[PDB]
Amino acid sequence: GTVSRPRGMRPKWHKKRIKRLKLRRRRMRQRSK
Amino acid sequence: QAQVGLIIKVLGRTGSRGNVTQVRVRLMAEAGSPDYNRTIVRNVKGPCKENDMLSLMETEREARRL
Amino acid sequence: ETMARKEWYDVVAPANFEKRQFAKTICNKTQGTRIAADVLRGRVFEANLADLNQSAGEEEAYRKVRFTVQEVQGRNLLTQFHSMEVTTDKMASLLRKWCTTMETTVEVKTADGYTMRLFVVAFTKPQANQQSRNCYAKQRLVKWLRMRITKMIKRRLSKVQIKEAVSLLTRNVLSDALVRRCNPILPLRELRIRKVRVVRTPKFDAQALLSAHGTIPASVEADQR
Amino acid sequence: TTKRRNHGRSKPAHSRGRVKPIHCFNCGRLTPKDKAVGRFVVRRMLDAASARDVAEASPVYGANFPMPRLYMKQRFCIACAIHSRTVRARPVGNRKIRYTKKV
Amino acid sequence: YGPNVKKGDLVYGVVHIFASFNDTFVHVTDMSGRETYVKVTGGMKVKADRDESSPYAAMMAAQDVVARCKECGINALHVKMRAVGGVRTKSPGPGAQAALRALARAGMKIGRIEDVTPIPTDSTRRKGSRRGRRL
RNA sequence: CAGAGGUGAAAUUCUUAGACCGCACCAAGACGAACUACAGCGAAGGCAUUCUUCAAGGAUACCUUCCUCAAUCAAGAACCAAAGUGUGGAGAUCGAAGAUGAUUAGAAACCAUUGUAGUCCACACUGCAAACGAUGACACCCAUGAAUUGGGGAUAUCUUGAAUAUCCUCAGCACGUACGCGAAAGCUUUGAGGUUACAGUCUCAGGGGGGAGUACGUUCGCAAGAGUGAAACUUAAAGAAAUUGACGGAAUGGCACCACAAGACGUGGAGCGUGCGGUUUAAUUUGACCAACACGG
Ligand SMILES: [K+]
Ligand SMILES: [Mg+2]
Ligand SMILES: [Mg+2]
Ligand SMILES: [Mg+2]
Ligand SMILES: [Mg+2]
Ligand SMILES: [Mg+2]
Ligand SMILES: [Mg+2]
Ligand SMILES: [Mg+2]
Ligand SMILES: [Mg+2]
Ligand SMILES: [Mg+2]
Ligand SMILES: [Mg+2]
Ligand SMILES: [Mg+2]
Ligand SMILES: [Mg+2]
Ligand SMILES: [Mg+2]
Ligand SMILES: [Mg+2]
Ligand SMILES: [Mg+2]
Ligand SMILES: [Mg+2]
Numbered sequence A: 001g002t003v004s005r006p007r008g009m010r011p012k013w014h015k016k017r018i019k020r021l022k023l024r025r026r027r028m029r030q031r032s033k
Numbered sequence B: 001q002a003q004v005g006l007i008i009k010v011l012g013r014t015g016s017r018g019n020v021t022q023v024r025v026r027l028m029a030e031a032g033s034p035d036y037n038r039t040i041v042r043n044v045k046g047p048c049k050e051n052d053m054l055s056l057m058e059t060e061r062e063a064r065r066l
Numbered sequence C: 001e002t003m004a005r006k007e008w009y010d011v012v013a014p015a016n017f018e019k020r021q022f023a024k025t026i027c028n029k030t031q032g033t034r035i036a037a038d039v040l041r042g043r044v045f046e047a048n049l050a051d052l053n054q055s056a057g058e059e060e061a062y063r064k065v066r067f068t069v070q071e072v073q074g075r076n077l078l079t080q081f082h083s084m085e086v087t088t089d090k091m092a093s094l095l096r097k098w099c100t101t102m103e104t105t106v107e108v109k110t111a112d113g114y115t116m117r118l119f120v121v122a123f124t125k126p127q128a129n130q131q132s133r134n135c136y137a138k139q140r141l142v143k144w145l146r147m148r149i150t151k152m153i154k155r156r157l158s159k160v161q162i163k164e165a166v167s168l169l170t171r172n173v174l175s176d177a178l179v180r181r182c183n184p185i186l187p188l189r190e191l192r193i194r195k196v197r198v199v200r201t202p203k204f205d206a207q208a209l210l211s212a213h214g215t216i217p218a219s220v221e222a223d224q225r
Numbered sequence D: 001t002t003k004r005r006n007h008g009r010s011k012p013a014h015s016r017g018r019v020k021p022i023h024c025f026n027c028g029r030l031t032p033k034d035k036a037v038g039r040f041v042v043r044r045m046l047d048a049a050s051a052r053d054v055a056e057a058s059p060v061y062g063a064n065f066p067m068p069r070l071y072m073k074q075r076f077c078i079a080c081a082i083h084s085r086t087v088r089a090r091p092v093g094n095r096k097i098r099y100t101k102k103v
Numbered sequence E: 001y002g003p004n005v006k007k008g009d010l011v012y013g014v015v016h017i018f019a020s021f022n023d024t025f026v027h028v029t030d031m032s033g034r035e036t037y038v039k040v041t042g043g044m045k046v047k048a049d050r051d052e053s054s055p056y057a058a059m060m061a062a063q064d065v066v067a068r069c070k071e072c073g074i075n076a077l078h079v080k081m082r083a084v085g086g087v088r089t090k091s092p093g094p095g096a097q098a099a100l101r102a103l104a105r106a107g108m109k110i111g112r113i114e115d116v117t118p119i120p121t122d123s124t125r126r127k128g129s130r131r132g133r134r135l
Numbered sequence F: 001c002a003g004a005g006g007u008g009a010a011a012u013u014c015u016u017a018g019a020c021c022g023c024a025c026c027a028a029g030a031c032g033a034a035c036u037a038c039a040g041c042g043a044a045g046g047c048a049u050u051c052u053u054c055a056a057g058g059a060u061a062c063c064u065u066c067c068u069c070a071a072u073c074a075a076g077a078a079c080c081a082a083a084g085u086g087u088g089g090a091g092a093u094c095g096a097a098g099a100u101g102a103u104u105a106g107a108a109a110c111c112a113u114u115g116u117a118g119u120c121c122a123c124a125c126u127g128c129a130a131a132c133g134a135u136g137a138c139a140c141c142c143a144u145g146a147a148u149u150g151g152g153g154a155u156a157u158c159u160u161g162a163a164u165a166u167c168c169u170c171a172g173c174a175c176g177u178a179c180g181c182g183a184a185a186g187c188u189u190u191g192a193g194g195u196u197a198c199a200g201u202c203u204c205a206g207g208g209g210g211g212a213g214u215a216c217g218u219u220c221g222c223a224a225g226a227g228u229g230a231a232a233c234u235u236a237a238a239g240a241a242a243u244u245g246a247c248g249g250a251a252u253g254g255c256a257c258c259a260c261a262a263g264a265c266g267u268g269g270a271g272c273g274u275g276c277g278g279u280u281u282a283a284u285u286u287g288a289c290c291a292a293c294a295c296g297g
């Protein structure tokens, strides 16, 4: 409990997902540069 | 050897299924004995009531209160 | 067999206690280069103060005393005061909630060496007509009480010998003087010394230990049945 | 939805910022010392029958001399306080009842 | 093997009753603690791991201790009780009371009783996470 | 001297090369129990042993000084739990990663035994928290009772100045039961009141849900990342507070042989009667799947 219904997964893990996505995109572009 | 004990009060049915009775028993011993009038809490199975008599195989164990 | 090689000994408290031959102990027989007296020295025996001073009352039953074995005299174990302590149950029971628990550590060396640490504990109390929900002490009064206790204990104990210091602590005249002279600072429910520990001993003296015990009672352990 | 005006703890908004946690007596969970459920327990070492048997064999203990007790300040996390029934969920009207003394 | 005292004189030991929630120790020493007379535990009396902390194993251990210490010559016992203490539980395990009762009933005299579980005036961090043990 | 540990029960692990346990010590690193509170201090983050020391900060007291010097904010600046980063140090405890043992359908988890990085210190970074009172700062008015912390003012008790008593007062953290407000939960001199009868002052942010605090650019950062921050596109709701039901491996109080306990007979195993289903058949007419199946008499 302690919270209302989220739209999808737990927001902290969704934020962790987006973090890993940003790190991968940064690595990709540093590769192309 | 078995000591004889006299049930002096029924404290209530113990256990989850209600098949055990918790009773207070006084050890019926001869006067001048260490266990004379000594009382102890025992768990009993079977139909029992006040002033019934039990055969204690051991007199050192007391039943945990309920 | 394990106990067939064991011998019995008497532990002897110093002469300022009434029950001289408190406690009994066993040790291995001397065998080879391993001498019993050489492992016996340094053993520490704990005893209730009420057992040692039978003529004392109920407060003595809450204080434990430890003695260390200086020397072996036949089957007697000559001892010196090691430590003293309130029992855990009594100290735990002395605590209340809505009051200040003020502790003082005092370190004082007796007139013959023998540094000791005193560990004094005191409690505030409400006054007779007080209606307040607590009797917490102001920090200035706590520091003043601590300073006064330190001064009184150092002055009283640096002047005397180890045996007289032990007599002051066990007959708790020092604690009575402390509560009498410290109550004007703060009203005190209780001021007691919870533990005394000898922390530094002087070099071993034979004459001083023999003067600590006076008339040494005989040990019958060595004699035959 | 705010369940409690005190938010389950003794820390008003402008009293202090951080209260150092303690380990739950039962599970070890870290709990702010204000929030934890604190009980001071004075416990007999033996029940009445064991006490009688031991006092019969003791020159120290008897009617004149009481046997020692156990003293413990116990602080519980909320889950362990509820599970051990030292504290129970209460009806909304009864939640404001506070006891200041032991009863 | 006993001390050379008159008949019925009280020769004291100290019993260290260590009742955790996993086991029970009944340990008799002299009053300095250095020399051990006898040590019997619950696991010395039961076959199953789950039974060593129980009152019955503790009582059997206390009976053994009295049996051996009667031939040692010790007949009176000062008592030291402890829980695990330290940074773990201060509540004694189930077997302390039973061991002490069996000591008293089997014919030993009881002297001073004291509770000596180690209490920190401040401690190292206790096992488990900040979330505690999660069952 | 034969076990100890650990669990729901175990096993991993330790142990006659003496473990566990016992007494007194030694060393090292953390931490400062009980007292500890709807208590104190701090701008916030935070801060509990003692003593000695450095600078501060607030309140109170004042017929001291002074004379508008203020309030609040882009820009700029300083501080900031934990985790994390760098260089030295430390390394007891606990413990991300990992190892082993259990549990399980599987179990990379929860549980057990361990254990690296960490956890602690100095110096330098990072600048994010449910960094919360989810409530910006300054100022005014505002009902009642019991309290509490510090300082003052006036006039019963105890010790020998300290504390306590009664009353008042300024400042502080709060509690219970008035207006008034609010969608309500609730708030209430501690406003979320004094607002459609809408104006004391300054300032930050918001404008249906997602996409998304994502992309691109840029600044900062050793890095991790931080700050700033869209659109295409998609969607009719998302959301809030309360109400009544239903449900809960939540609590409490009761109850039942269509429940169990103590039991007695059976059934499930065989043969056979009967009903139901499958297969078959030209058709094997159909209904019914605890509350169908010797039921549709
Ligand atoms: K960024
Ligand atoms: Mg819930
Ligand atoms: Mg909720
Ligand atoms: Mg929300
Ligand atoms: Mg006060
Ligand atoms: Mg809370
Ligand atoms: Mg403050
Ligand atoms: Mg905080
Ligand atoms: Mg609470
Ligand atoms: Mg659970
Ligand atoms: Mg074991
Ligand atoms: Mg060894
Ligand atoms: Mg070890
Ligand atoms: Mg402290
Ligand atoms: Mg850090
Ligand atoms: Mg770190
Ligand atoms: Mg380490």
Ligand SMILES: [Mg+2]
Residues within 6 Å of the ligand: F095, F115
């Ligand atoms: Mg570890």
Ligand SMILES: [Mg+2]
Residues within 6 Å of the ligand: none
């Ligand atoms: Mg699960």
Ligand SMILES: [Mg+2]
Residues within 6 Å of the ligand: none
């Ligand atoms: Mg583990």
Ligand SMILES: [Mg+2]
Residues within 6 Å of the ligand: none
């Ligand atoms: Mg929008």
Ligand SMILES: [Mg+2]
Residues within 6 Å of the ligand: none
């Ligand atoms: Mg059949």
Ligand SMILES: [Mg+2]
Residues within 6 Å of the ligand: F286
């Ligand atoms: Mg039809």
Ligand SMILES: [Mg+2]
Residues within 6 Å of the ligand: F287
């Ligand atoms: Mg039909």
Ligand SMILES: [Mg+2]
Residues within 6 Å of the ligand: F295
């Ligand atoms: Mg039918």
Ligand code: NA
Residues within 6 Å of the ligand: F130, F132
């Ligand atoms: Na909060």
